[PDB]
């Protein structure tokens, strides 16, 4: 699919057995999802952006489906204001920017 | 061009006649460039990101070249960690996400 940028590029994702909406973000190195009770081990992390840093929990090898495309990788969980799909998963679904 | 996402989508921009590097950022509504002297009138604005809000200078109708493509629109100038081209100017250069 092709997604224009007139509005925030939100798509449905599936993660942890739940459906959420998330932002496809080429400006994010990492994928950051709203607080959710994912199973298993995790490592503390801090990620930053405009505004400063927030504290998140890093989960590895998480299966996520993004707009119907399966992916598997690292997901950070914490108090983000929006669900963000970063480049670590955008590459896996073969996403590009074109102009 | 077509740009893949294995590395940060950094490109050259010209703004105020100066070359800078900036990140093509589909997760950003707005374009935010690091503190600089820029010709044009501005007003104080606040913008938010992953870790809180910063103060910026809002400049409307600024001519900018992004990866060789012209845009004329609002540029926010302030203490962003990385120069970011957001959707307001990505739309002007005709950028889409594709997968
Ligand atoms: C999400 C994180 C992992 C991402 N950061 C990064 O990818 C890299 O972060 C840094 C931080 C400091 C220095 C160098 C690099 C980011 O903020 N990405 C932003 C761009 C950016 C800002 C500052 C530094 C680097 C990138 C931008 O894409 C995301 O904010 C949008 C998403 C959004 C939409 C609405 C409300 C809030 C947040």
Numbering used by the authors:
A (entry chain A), B (entry chain B): 1 to 99
Quote the study's own text:
HIV-1 protease (PR) is an excellent target for antiretroviral therapy due to its crucial role in the life cycle of the human immunodeficiency virus (HIV). HIV-1 protease is a homodimer, with both chains participating in forming the active site of the enzyme. It processes the polyproteins into the structural proteins and enzymes during virion maturation. Inhibitors of PR target the active site of PR to inhibit the activity of the enzyme, thus preventing cleavage of Gag and Gag-Pol polyproteins and resulting in production of non-infectious virus particles.
PR was complexed with a new potent inhibitor containing an epoxy moiety within a Phe-Phe pseudodipeptide fragment. Analysis of the crystal structure of PR/EPX complex at 1.45 Å shows that the active site of PR is fully occupied by EPX in a single conformation with a surprisingly intact epoxide ring. This result is in contradiction with the general behavior of epoxide-containing molecules that usually show high reactivity towards nucleophiles, leading to ring opening. Previous crystallographic studies on PR/EPX complex evidenced that the β-carboxylate group of the catalytic aspartate residue 25B is involved in hydrogen bonding with the hydroxyl group of the inhibitor, contributing to successfully stabilizing the inhibitor in the active site. Conversely, the carboxyl group of the other aspartic acid 25A is in very close contact with one of the carbons of the oxirane ring. The distance between the two atoms is only 3.10 Å and the carboxylate oxygen atom is well aligned with the epoxide ring forming an angle of 95° with the carbon–carbon bond of the ring. However, a water molecule was found at hydrogen-bond distance from the oxygen and could provide protons to assist the epoxide opening. This evidence suggested that the reaction did not occur at pH 6.0, as described by the reported crystal structure, because Asp25A was not available as a nucleophile in the catalytic site, since it was protonated. From the stereochemical point of view, both oxirane carbon atoms of the EPX inhibitor, selected by PR, have absolute R-configuration. In particular, EPX forms two hydrogen bonds with the carbonyl O atoms of 27A and 48A glycine residues, acting as acceptor, and a hydrogen bond with the NH of aspartate 29A, acting as donor.
